[PDB]
Design a protein around this ligand. Structure first.
Ligand SMILES: *[C@@H]1O[C@H](CO)[C@@H](O)[C@H](O)[C@H]1NC(C)=O
Lengths: 38, 22
C-alpha cells in the first residue's frame, strides 16, 4: 500500500504584549495552524 | 485575469481585498 507522509503541525509563535510599564498580560499567536493540535 | 512544509510560509496581508475595495 501507499502512504502519503506529511510533516505534522508546525508554525510560528508570536507574543502580543503591551508596554512593560502598563501590564504583563500576553497573547500567543500560532500562525497558519488550526486550533486543534494546540 | 492574474494567476510548503519546509519552514517557509506566507503571512496574509493586514488589509484584506474587501477592505481595499471599500
Ligand atoms: C479546523 O478544524 C475544524 C474541525 O475539523 C474545522 O471545522 C475547521 O474548519 C478547521 N479550520 C481551518 C481554518 O481549517
Amino acid at each position: 500500500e501507499i502512504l502519503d507522509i506529511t510533516p505534522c503541525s508546525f508554525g510560528g509563535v508570536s507574543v502580543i504584549t503591551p508596554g512593560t510599564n502598563t501590564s504583563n498580560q500576553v497573547a500567543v499567536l500560532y500562525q497558519d495552524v488550526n486550533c486543534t493540535e494546540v | 485575469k492574474v494567476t510548503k512544509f519546509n519552514g517557509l510560509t506566507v503571512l496574509p496581508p493586514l488589509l484584506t481585498d474587501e477592505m481595499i475595495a471599500q
